[PDB]
Amino acid sequence: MTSTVEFINRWQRIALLSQSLLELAQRGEWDLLLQQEVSYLQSIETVMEKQTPPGITRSIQDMVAGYIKQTLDNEQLLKGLLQQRLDELSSLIGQVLFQGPSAGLVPRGSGGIEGMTTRLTRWLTALDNFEAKMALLPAV
Numbered sequence: 671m672t673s674t675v676e677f678i679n680r681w682q683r684i685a686l687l688s689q690s691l692l693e694l695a696q697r698g699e700w701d702l703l704l705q706q707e708v709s710y711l712q713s714i715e716t717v718m719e720k721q722t723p724p725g726i727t728r729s730i731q732d733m734v735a736g737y738i739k740q741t742l743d744n745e746q747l748l749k750g751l752l753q754q755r756l757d758e759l760s761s762l763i764g765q766v767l768f769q770g771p772s773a774g775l776v777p778r779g780s781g782g783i784e785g786m787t788t789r790l791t792r793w794l795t796a797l798d799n800f801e802a803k804m805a806l807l808p809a810v
Contacts, residue, residue, distance in 0.1 A: 688744035
């Protein structure tokens with residue numbers, strides 16, 4: 671049951687990762703967001719590579735759908751929080767737009783803020799990508 675184990679375990683990892691990253695975002699610990707970033711996005715992509723058949727079984731789908739509720743709620747709260755956070759941060763760095771919930775805040779950071787902005791913008795658009803594409807999953 672290798673594909674079963676990988677599918678449920680990876681959804682479990684994404685659920686626990688997004689939960690952890692949510693708590694950290696609520697506490698202001700952006701450091702572990704930047705670290706576990708690559709971990710979270712990797713787990714997302716690799717579970718989505720495990721395309722399960724239309725006729726998925728009861729227990730698998732129930733546990734998976736639970737982890738899907740976890741990660742989509744955690745990442746929803748992450749998405750809005752980090753959208754408003756990068757909003758404020760770009761306002762601190764220079765000036766934010768009245769509306770700019772996309773990859774446009776700080777075009778050339780140059781110094782240490784360069785990595786922060788480019789990561790978290792690629793991150794938010796990869797979150798929105800996961801959200802959308804996994805909602806578009808015809809067979810999970």
